Design an enzyme around this catalytic site. Structure first.
Site, mmCIF file in Angstrom:
data_model
loop_
_atom_site.group_PDB
_atom_site.id
_atom_site.type_symbol
_atom_site.label_atom_id
_atom_site.label_comp_id
_atom_site.label_asym_id
_atom_site.label_seq_id
_atom_site.Cartn_x
_atom_site.Cartn_y
_atom_site.Cartn_z
ATOM 1 N N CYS A 15 0.799 -1.209 0.000
ATOM 2 C CA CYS A 15 0.000 0.000 0.000
ATOM 3 C C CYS A 15 0.835 1.263 0.000
ATOM 4 O O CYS A 15 1.927 1.294 0.568
ATOM 5 C CB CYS A 15 -0.915 0.031 1.198
ATOM 6 S SG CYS A 15 -1.959 1.487 1.213
ATOM 7 N N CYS A 17 0.371 4.015 1.547
ATOM 8 C CA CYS A 17 0.557 4.600 2.895
ATOM 9 C C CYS A 17 1.852 4.153 3.556
ATOM 10 O O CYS A 17 2.222 4.696 4.590
ATOM 11 C CB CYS A 17 -0.608 4.243 3.831
ATOM 12 S SG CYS A 17 -0.644 2.509 4.344
ATOM 13 N N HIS A 23 -2.615 -3.600 6.802
ATOM 14 C CA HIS A 23 -2.955 -4.509 5.679
ATOM 15 C C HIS A 23 -2.513 -5.926 5.901
ATOM 16 O O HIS A 23 -1.326 -6.226 5.732
ATOM 17 C CB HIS A 23 -2.365 -3.959 4.390
ATOM 18 C CG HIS A 23 -2.813 -2.590 4.128
ATOM 19 N ND1 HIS A 23 -4.093 -2.315 3.945
ATOM 20 C CD2 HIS A 23 -2.138 -1.379 4.141
ATOM 21 C CE1 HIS A 23 -4.236 -1.014 3.797
ATOM 22 N NE2 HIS A 23 -3.043 -0.439 3.930
ATOM 23 N N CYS A 99 -6.379 4.301 5.870
ATOM 24 C CA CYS A 99 -4.940 4.431 6.126
ATOM 25 C C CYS A 99 -4.256 5.517 5.282
ATOM 26 O O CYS A 99 -3.061 5.753 5.421
ATOM 27 C CB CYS A 99 -4.253 3.094 5.875
ATOM 28 S SG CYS A 99 -4.525 2.423 4.221
ATOM 29 N N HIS A 151 -11.139 -15.205 -4.510
ATOM 30 C CA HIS A 151 -12.309 -14.339 -4.358
ATOM 31 C C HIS A 151 -12.541 -13.465 -5.555
ATOM 32 O O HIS A 151 -13.596 -12.822 -5.655
ATOM 33 C CB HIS A 151 -12.123 -13.426 -3.164
ATOM 34 C CG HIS A 151 -12.120 -14.145 -1.849
ATOM 35 N ND1 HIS A 151 -13.183 -14.822 -1.400
ATOM 36 C CD2 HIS A 151 -11.152 -14.230 -0.863
ATOM 37 C CE1 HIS A 151 -12.903 -15.335 -0.184
ATOM 38 N NE2 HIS A 151 -11.657 -14.974 0.141
HETATM 39 O O1 LIG Z 1 -8.455 -15.357 4.018
HETATM 40 C C1 LIG Z 1 -8.984 -14.683 3.129
HETATM 41 N N1 LIG Z 1 -9.356 -15.195 1.953
HETATM 42 O O2 LIG Z 1 -9.235 -16.547 1.651
HETATM 43 C C2 LIG Z 1 -9.368 -13.208 3.191
HETATM 44 C C3 LIG Z 1 -8.258 -12.154 3.259
HETATM 45 C C4 LIG Z 1 -6.853 -12.458 3.597
HETATM 46 C C5 LIG Z 1 -6.056 -13.119 2.677
HETATM 47 C C6 LIG Z 1 -4.712 -13.358 2.976
HETATM 48 C C7 LIG Z 1 -4.165 -12.922 4.187
HETATM 49 C C8 LIG Z 1 -4.974 -12.231 5.095
HETATM 50 C C9 LIG Z 1 -6.312 -11.992 4.791
HETATM 51 C C10 LIG Z 1 -9.224 -12.313 4.439
HETATM 52 C C11 LIG Z 1 -10.382 -11.377 4.607
HETATM 53 C C12 LIG Z 1 -11.316 -11.737 5.575
HETATM 54 C C13 LIG Z 1 -12.436 -10.961 5.828
HETATM 55 C C14 LIG Z 1 -12.643 -9.793 5.116
HETATM 56 C C15 LIG Z 1 -13.882 -9.027 5.434
HETATM 57 C C16 LIG Z 1 -14.439 -8.848 6.697
HETATM 58 N N2 LIG Z 1 -15.577 -8.127 6.556
HETATM 59 C C17 LIG Z 1 -15.767 -7.855 5.241
HETATM 60 O O3 LIG Z 1 -14.718 -8.417 4.531
HETATM 61 C C18 LIG Z 1 -11.728 -9.417 4.128
HETATM 62 C C19 LIG Z 1 -10.593 -10.202 3.875
HETATM 63 ZN ZN LIG Z 2 -9.091 -17.218 3.718
HETATM 64 ZN ZN LIG Z 3 -2.477 1.548 3.487
#
Ligand SMILES: O=C(NO)[C@@H]1[C@H](c2ccccc2)[C@H]1c1ccc(-c2cnco2)cc1
Ligand SMILES: [Zn+2]
Ligand SMILES: [Zn+2]
Ligand code: NA
Ligand code: NA
Length: 380
Positions: A15, A17, A23, A99, A151
């Site tokens: 990012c 920032c 993050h 941020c 995703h």
């Molecule tokens: O594990 C994950 N994907 O498989 C997703 C991202 C991740 C990936 C790798 C490392 C760390 C995090 C994690 C995530 C969980 C909840 C939200 C969320 C919460 N409320 C709205 O959206 C947004 C992202």
């Molecule tokens: Zn996950």
């Molecule tokens: Zn940032």
């Protein structure tokens, strides 16, 4: 011989920032996994292949043109290449995050100098490895990549994902090799809404996700058991969805139970030519209730890997998705590569190996079984 892929240009997705503490999906994730494999000697025993960036043609098997221009090019060429005039004003796509950095939706970031390159190298790394295993140039492999993929929808980035690296791998396998049957297993704790979308109507690709569902509000709120596929694809989408919340939290007994009673029987019947794994490690102990909540051990993923290795004549490839906690994701990555290489599994305690899965786990398993009983002989 087992393969590994990694590239230090993926570290540059960061990012604006200038502070990775805001993050969770940060550069250090891969860096640490990478050094863990060095300091254990596992990297020495593997072949480390050369990555590359995915072409826009390759990304367009899953994602729209508009989306690939928006997140796959630097700004100068972004105008150059948009001859069809698909993109509106960037003014409406970019927002300032809490941020202070530049991002695209309220959660997801964007670096205009480095993210497009990084997002494309993640895909190209997976693809290279997948094709090397599919043609029999390697036994199996592990893709230590970033950012994650599962995703990413046709035209929407979300959950810190921009392109669905594993989906693209699969599509290319179909188009350029005519691979008849592909299995995608997604054991990241979150549902892979992108992957489900990309093969929902295709019966030559079977998508199985183990994930926390809880009646639809755990992120990302898709992946219900009764979502089974559409058209000729009916029955080739298996959402092993856990319900009941964290009372108690799911762990090794539960997951091993689901593998034996749902995942492996179905996978065996399908009898796939190649197995792809969205290998997120956020189900491991040490992921608080927003990000995870479950209590798996890293060791356990060694057992899950070994089980999948029995399929497809061993042609299995794991690609990193989620997983935040550094000890956990390094420990788990250790287990998996160790399994892929052929070593004896560093066991779980007999206390665990004798544990009956919790009531919630059982109820969740019986619902899936009843639904997919219509489509699979091994569940009748
Ligand atoms: O594990 C994950 N994907 O498989 C997703 C991202 C991740 C990936 C790798 C490392 C760390 C995090 C994690 C995530 C969980 C909840 C939200 C969320 C919460 N409320 C709205 O959206 C947004 C992202
Ligand atoms: Zn996950
Ligand atoms: Zn940032
Ligand atoms: Na999953
Ligand atoms: Na499918």
């Amino acid at each position: 011989t087992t393969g590994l892929v990694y590239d230090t240009l993926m570290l540059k997705h960061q990012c604006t920032c200038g502070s990775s503490s805001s993050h969770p999906e940060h550069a250090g994730r891969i860096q640490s996994i990478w050094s863990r494999l060095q300091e254990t000697g596992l990297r020495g025993k593997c072949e480390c292949i050369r990555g590359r960036k995915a072409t826009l043609e390759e990304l367009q098997t899953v994602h729209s043109e508009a989306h690939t221009l928006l997140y796959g090019t630097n700004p100068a060429n972004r105008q150059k290449l948009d001859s069809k005039k698909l993109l509106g004003s960037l003014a409406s796509v970019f927002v300032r995050l809490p941020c202070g950095g530049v991002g695209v939706d309220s959660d997801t970031i964007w670096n205009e100098v480095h993210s497009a390159g990084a997002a494309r190298l993640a895909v190209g790394c997976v693809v290279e490895l997948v094709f090397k295993v599919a043609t029999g140039e390697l036994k199996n492999g592990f893709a230590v990549v970033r950012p994650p993929g599962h995703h990413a929808e046709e035209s929407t980035p979300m959950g810190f994902c921009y392109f669905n690296s594993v989906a693209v791998a699969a599509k290319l396998l179909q188009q350029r090799l005519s691979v008849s049957k592909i299995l995608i297993v997604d054991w990241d704790v979150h549902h892979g809404n992108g992957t489900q979308q990309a093969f929902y109507s295709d019966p030559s690709v079977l998508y199985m996700s183990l994930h926390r569902y809880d009646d639809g509000n755990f992120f990302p709120g898709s992946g219900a058991p009764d979502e089974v596929g559409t058209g000729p694809g009916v029955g080739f989408n298996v959402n092993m969805a856990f319900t009941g919340g964290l009372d108690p939290p799911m762990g090794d007994a539960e997951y091993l139970a689901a593998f034996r009673t749902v995942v492996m029987p179905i996978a065996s019947e399908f009898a796939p030519d190649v197995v792809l794994v969205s290998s997120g490690f956020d189900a491991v102990e040490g992921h608080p209730t927003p990000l995870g909540g479950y209590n798996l051990s890293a060791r356990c993923f060694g057992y899950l890997t070994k089980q999948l290795m029995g399929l497809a004549g061993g042609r299995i490839v794991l690609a990193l998705e989620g997983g935040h906690d550094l000890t956990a994701i390094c420990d788990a990555s250790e287990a998996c590569v160790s399994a892929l290489l052929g070593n004896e599994l560093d066991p779980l305690p007999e206390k665990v190996l004798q544990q009956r899965p919790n009531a919630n786990a059982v109820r969740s398993m019986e619902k899936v079984m009843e639904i997919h009983s219509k489509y699979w002989r091994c569940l009748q």
